[model samples]
Target chain A: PSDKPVAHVVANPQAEGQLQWLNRRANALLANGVELRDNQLVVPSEGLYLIYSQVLFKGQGCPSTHVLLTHTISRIAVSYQTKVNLLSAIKSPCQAKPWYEPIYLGGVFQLEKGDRLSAEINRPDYLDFAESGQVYFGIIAL
Target chain B: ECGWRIGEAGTDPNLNHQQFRAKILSIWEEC
Candidate 1:
């Protein structure tokens, strides 16, 4: 409701193969409340972004997930959820943010079908529009 | 008890020493 332009970040719009899995994680980040850093696909930011990655699991395929924390403008990495005994980190609002809200860091949960392997983001008006607007994925400090 | 039992260590200086000394020993035991 901020009237801000919607910024949809497709991991790789034309990417196929393993890259397609990026969209899955992207969906999760969107649902949780990640915002675009600079309204761009990959420019880095002064906040956190949920990240995801995929792996090959024999015949089942290696589908993975991670909360990408872009601590600064130059540094970036993914906090992977380990699939031990068939368990993985789904979503956590406070992963990068230690003291946020109920949507803080977003709690972890089980992934469902179509859940992608990796993604990360942060919107500008998350705090104001958390309920009706968009769930905050991560911090996007411009 | 707020870690202090009322009247257990009366105003008697000697009793205070005796009671507080035992209290210290009891805490050390739990630790």
Candidate 2:
């Protein structure tokens, strides 16, 4: 069982609008061996892993002239000794118009034991945190 | 200016697509 490095986790269904680390549900994928603590996905062991994140932004209808929405997947790999930007996606819509934008990013990455993963947003107030799929974060050991 | 990848400041060619997937799948299955 220790050799089984597969694990994945979903975001906290109760999370709200805030520019902070998105909380994750530890047991959501605990059966698969993934665990979460302090909003970070704790790697079970050292190996190549696939990390992913998705964020959805919604507004009433019309907005100011310039608006920017940013979605980022960050990591705290032990090898680096600090948090680094894994991947990021941004959307900038010009003019006033109703918009509902969703961004997703994922990639295979080398990870060491004790590494951590998290999702963040620049404009968190526009995020729609629904249990279904408004926002989520996960990782799988390949 | 979009997505980017990095290595440990001096390690050139840290990883590649084929190498990344192959090594990861090496421990795949049995889940």
Candidate 3:
């Protein structure tokens, strides 16, 4: 029974924008049956999956007034061939200079084989991705 | 479950997919 498929991908600030995934040699950040392609995870079968993502927002180097940040988990469904936003979280942190806010989101959805999922943030420069746990994306069968 | 699981957590990198699946499946229990 050690063949279940899942994926827990860490993040790298260097990737920026579309959010890059790191397949660290670390077991805590590996993929099973789930396909990791660039910044998206491709579903291998049809079922309900609990998908989640987290991003740590930093005030360092943030634009003076661009304080609002958003993290979104989107799904490209095979059912309609459309990009659907399954979950989204928005936060405002700035002004005070050294502020940090981490947004985590998760939900269960009916996913079809070949469906793709990814996380995106409005700004990549202010991301605190010094470690894997600080920012990550994961999905497991429900 | 995502709090502080470290390598000392020793979730062996070589765990078969099923083994890895069980580990994380439980972790998600808290998320």
Specify the highest-DockQ model's number.
3
* lDDT of residue A141 for candidate 1: 14
The per-residue C-alpha lDDT of model 1 at residue B5 equals 23
lDDT of 1 by residue, A9-91 (tens): 22333332322212344232232233334321332322322221111111112124333222111222323434222112222
lDDT per model, in order? 0.25, 0.58, 0.70
Please name the candidate that would achieve the greatest lDDT relative to the true structure: 3
Q: Which docking class does model 3 fall in?
A: acceptable
Using alpha carbons, what is the TM-score of model 3?
0.78
Model 2 chain A weakest 10-residue run by lDDT: A19-28
**Number of clashing pairs per prediction, in order:** 33, 0, 3
User: DockQ of candidates 1 onward, in order?
Assistant: 0.01, 0.04, 0.31
Highest TM-score: give the candidate number: 3
Q: Say which prediction, candidate 2 or candidate 3, comes out ahead on TM-score.
A: 3
lDDT of 2 by residue, A7-98 (tens): 43444545565633333332344334456677677887788777766666777665545678888888886667688998989897445345
Runs of candidate 1 exceeding 4 Å displacement = A1-6, A10-15, A20-40, A43-142, B1-31
Model 3 accuracy (lDDT, Cα): 0.70
